[PDB]
Design a binder for this molecule. Sequence first.
Ligand SMILES: COCCN/C=C1/C(=O)N(C)c2ccc(C(F)(F)F)cc2N(c2ccccc2)C1=O
Ligand SMILES: COCCN/C=C1/C(=O)N(C)c2ccc(C(F)(F)F)cc2N(c2ccccc2)C1=O
Ligand code: NA
Ligand code: NA
Lengths: 146, 146
Amino acid sequence: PIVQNLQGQMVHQAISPRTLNAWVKVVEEKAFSPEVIPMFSALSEGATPQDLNTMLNTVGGHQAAMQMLKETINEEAAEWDRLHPVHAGPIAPGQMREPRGSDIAGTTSTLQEQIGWMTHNPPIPVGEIYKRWIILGLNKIVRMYS
Amino acid sequence: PIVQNLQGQMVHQAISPRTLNAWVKVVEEKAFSPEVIPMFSALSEGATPQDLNTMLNTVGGHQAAMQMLKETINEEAAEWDRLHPVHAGPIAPGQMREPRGSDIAGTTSTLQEQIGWMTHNPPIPVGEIYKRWIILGLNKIVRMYS
Ligand SMILES: COCCN/C=C1/C(=O)N(C)c2ccc(C(F)(F)F)cc2N(c2ccccc2)C1=O
Ligand SMILES: COCCN/C=C1/C(=O)N(C)c2ccc(C(F)(F)F)cc2N(c2ccccc2)C1=O
Ligand code: NA
Ligand code: NA
């Protein structure tokens, strides 16, 4: 997630491995449990898409449940593009481009571009947007158990 | 916890009731379980003493376990005073005073004074210090189950 250092700068701070390890243990004990969702949202506060994917990849899960999660994310990303089309073409070096669904999901964006959108004014909270997509998918999983 | 708003300012953001509710459910299911500790540290990122006490009070627990926790905190606070004595007496209005153990524990300090120490340069991370005392006590509890 993003936090301000001892100067003023908004810097990225990776998620602690000990937090990740404890989290996977929680999910393992409360598989498909609704209470895990508010906890997921709590631990991902200020998280960038990169951080979110690290959490998702670390947890893993059932092949099938991961599918519904990915499909949900993909569906929401395509819905973002349908509503927020981005222009392709000429852009000067260092110019900020508008994020597409795949950028919000961290697939086609770097940590630096994610931080840029998140610390911009007006900000494009790509971390918050992606988290919502994930939570939608998690809420879908709990309701099928697959 | 403290977070920067849409201007630049370091503002306080209370813990979500939904997070608190989910957390108490976790502790209830994993009573005295070591894995809860890394999770406690994760959710209290950037937390002020006020936030920490809200979490502690919300969780509650066994009369006896709460005792060892309080006694541990009290013991560490007295140890902080023994090593970092603070001068009493004349101080101008609005002057920043050095925190004593009771201030770090949020007993004799306001949310505003806690934020002041935490956003000062060099900072007095009262939230981090208090969190360590709590985690020491939690590690004590797990090892007695009381
Ligand atoms: C470590 O795996 C052990 C067995 N549990 C697997 C699960 C699963 O298959 N998926 C795909 C995932 C993926 C990410 C997460 C996340 F960390 F993000 F929360 C939870 C989660 N949930 C889940 C979903 C909804 C509500 C509660 C838990 C599971 O139970
Ligand atoms: C809601 O209560 C249901 C039964 N569990 C009670 C417990 C207890 O009596 N105390 C005093 C506390 C107090 C705060 C916390 C905190 F939220 F901060 F983690 C955990 C905790 N732990 C605890 C201690 C060490 C490791 C894991 C859990 C307990 O089990
Ligand atoms: Na990437
Ligand atoms: Na207070």
